[PDB]
Amino acid sequence: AIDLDRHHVRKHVSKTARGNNAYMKLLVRLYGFLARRTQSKFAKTILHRLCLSRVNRPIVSTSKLACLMKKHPEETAVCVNTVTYDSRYPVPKMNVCALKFTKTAEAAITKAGGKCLRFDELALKAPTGRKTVLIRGKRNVREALKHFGKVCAKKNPAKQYKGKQTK
Amino acid sequence: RLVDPYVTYGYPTLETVQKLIYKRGALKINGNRMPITSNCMIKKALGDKDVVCVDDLVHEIYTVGKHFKEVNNKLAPFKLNGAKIAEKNKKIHFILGGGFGNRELLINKLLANMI
Amino acid sequence: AMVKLNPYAKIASHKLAQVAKAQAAHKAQYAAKMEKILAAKKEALNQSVAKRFGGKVIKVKVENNLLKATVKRTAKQDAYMKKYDGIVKANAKKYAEKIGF
RNA sequence: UAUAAGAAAUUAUUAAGAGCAAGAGAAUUAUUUCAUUUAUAGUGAUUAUUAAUAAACGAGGAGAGAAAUCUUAGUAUUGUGAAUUAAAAGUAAAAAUCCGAUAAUAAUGGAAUGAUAAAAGCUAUUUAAGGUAAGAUUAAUAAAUUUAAUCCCGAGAAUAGAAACUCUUGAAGAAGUAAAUUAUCUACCCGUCUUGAAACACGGACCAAGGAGUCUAACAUGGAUGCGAAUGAGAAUAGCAGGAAAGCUAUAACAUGAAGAGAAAACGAAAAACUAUGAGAGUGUAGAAAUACAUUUAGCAAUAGUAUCUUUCAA
RNA sequence: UUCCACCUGAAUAUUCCCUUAGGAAGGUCAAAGUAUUAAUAGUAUUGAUUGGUAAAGAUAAUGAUUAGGUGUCAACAUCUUGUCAAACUAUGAAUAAACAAAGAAGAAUUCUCAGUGUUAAAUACACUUCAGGAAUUUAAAUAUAAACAUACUUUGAAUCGGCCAAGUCUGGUAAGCAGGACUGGCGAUGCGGGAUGAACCGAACGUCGAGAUAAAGUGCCAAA
RNA sequence: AAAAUGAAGACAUUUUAACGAGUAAGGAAACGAAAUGGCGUAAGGACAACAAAAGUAGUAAAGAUUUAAAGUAAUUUAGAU
What we know:
This is part of a larger assembly, with chains A, B and C. By secondary structure, chain A is of the alpha/beta class. Helix content of chain A is 30%, strand content 14%. Chain A has helices at residues 22-38, 41-50, 62-68, 103-111, 119-125; strands spanning 60-61, 76-84, 95-101, 115-117, 132-134. In chain A, strands 1, 2, 3, 4 and 5 form a five-stranded parallel sheet that branches. The longest helix of chain C has 40 residues, at 9-48. In chain C, 0% of the residues are buried. The interface between B and C is small, with 8 and 6 residues. It is classed as ribosome. The entry lists the keywords LSU with P-tRNA CCA end, Ribosome, Entamoeba histolytica.
């Protein structure tokens, strides 16, 4: 035979839309077409982020969008994830393109004079991406990450899943 | 020298390099071992290294030019036939009449029956 | 497929065709010369086989120049053969001493 | 609707006729390969032309063979000779054998898997990049892959040329497939424990049917789903139409979360943050097909390190 | 302890247990899910090192041991000789171990330059993204391989009765004995050869056709 | 694995390249370029002659015995009794 370091195994990268969502299937069909034809790194990025699992597409709040759009007045924030609403802080005027908008987030963005776009309108208006800012939410804020590891560790102890008689 | 029991090697002639590249030559293009069929495929792969035809590929290998490393690393390892390896067996050095070791210019006789 | 890969094949093929035709003529014309030289040698041998013709009488000394010239060369070329023969003799002496240690 | 393509049917002749499948061929070919023959810039040895000296060697000395004309025989003159040398021949490529070097181009026949089409086929006519020992003839000379001349051939390119075939077998059974038998090769008893069982290790006489990771409850990870500073409220329970173990509606106690640290008392978070690398968007140039450099801009996720703040004896 | 095909594919180390026919941490392995990625190496070379094995030595230190001269029968000195050490050593390989060969992010230079502190005082020096800021130059710094590369994160299966070989070692008279260092295998593995064989030699396997082969063979069984 | 194409064709697309041994063990379902592909048993909700009589069945169901065909295989299909 042949002395290979390792045998061929499936590459651990998603290439389609997870689940049976008919609309999310068409979005991947649209951006898989755009990235192949336009050969734009922006469409390759949006296509890749559309294929992540739900846990890997964390939310972005209106407060975080406002901070990132401060020095970008006429721009379009583009986050492939649900956009929630931070009720603690005001929402300025800005245009956001996202997969889904919370009822309160959509009201707040619209009431400020902004716009809530979907990814087909963004591809229709800015296919290769010209006045957009790519944004993704934080991943390590998940509480599940606290318990990972060994809680007896000297350096970075875990968080000891609560249970029988935990003090 | 360290891997002597597992290899036999020597110094090729120009005709040995010519026949190996022409018949068994191949290139790694986009991770695919594409056999050599035209100069355009050679120009595409090694155009940046001023090797635009199969004769630049043969000449560079034989004389070991400036871009030997890049040209040689593109050439996929040749797959050869079988042949009478030795006189006694391949468990002794060619100096003792065996199969492995440094055959010097005598490696061309072996390669003649092997290509 | 060879022409497509190496367009210089036609140029090199023609030279191979020329040399093959030319080398055949040289060997063919050298054979004709050697037939005459062998014919000359045969005549000298058959004529000197008559040393059998004849109580010994001073054995039989045979003439030194029974072999006849077949090709003709100028005197300058005649002197060059004696020069060439001296060199090939010196080279053999040069080589024999070297391997003789 | 305009033009080929121009079907089926029809007329006269015969070199007078299907489809499919198997087999044998023909012509030109693709990949691999078998057998035979053929040349491989050895300056290696021999391959009758005469003569001389030899370092060594044993002998001699004064009826056979042939149609020869010349030798053989047996009852101190001469023979052989490695090696060296003279003259002749020889420009130092023939052939044969041996020793070295190689195995390649080609041709002639096949085999396995195919293909059928015309060319970056091949061929012919024009000009001429070239022929680096070697395309040829010459000359000067020469242990030359050293120089000059004029002949020859000729790559590119432009212009013109050429491929549609034979025979045999098959509904009187082709090709294939299956069953039984024969023949050559091949084949130890399954499951399990075990380093190791065909085992002189255990279970198995045979067949049918049954036969062994399920259910409830708590937690965690993960993939799909709804909503999102909230989610659930099929918590009990209360109403609706319909007659209903189904469906729908209930501004609601509570559960988890939004705030964390301390045994507890007592408390309870901004310098509207900083640094590094990093996703993306342009403009120019060039190769030139894609693509490769120059330059402007933004700096999300993630990792690490900083200040600052809450709690603790202790971060 | 009950159906098929396909893909990947192990273990006998380490710590603890009233533990030794068993468990948990951990290693090996699978599946899910990521990151443009200061995030490549069971390799060689060059340069600076480390160590005390093989060897070597034996009035070179500690020991063991056979003799012969000379000086004042011993004895004691001194000069030679013969033979040794796992718990002796001056010297000391081969094989190895750990570095460097340009990542505060691919160099360098010039100008300017601040906060602390060391300091007798510093413009020196130390740390501060080689604090910071601006210009010019620049892709260079052994070989070889590496983009289905690399770095992983989470969850989890089985496993920790092993056995064999040897230009190896220890106990034993020795063992197809008992126990170890390094590597390759069998276990988990069929195929060709050694008549036969878990480990030997060649070589690892989708279904086939044609060829050149390997170990090894060519009187017949048996192809040559 | 990478390119190309992609509302429906179809054979789970087209091309190129590398690869395919294996005990214990793992790879749940769904995911158009599909994060392994499938066969079988029984029951429940649907669909099954698109033009107002809409799957098969006394012109012979299920079952049983065999003969052949499709599939690498689990198995399926059809004929005869």
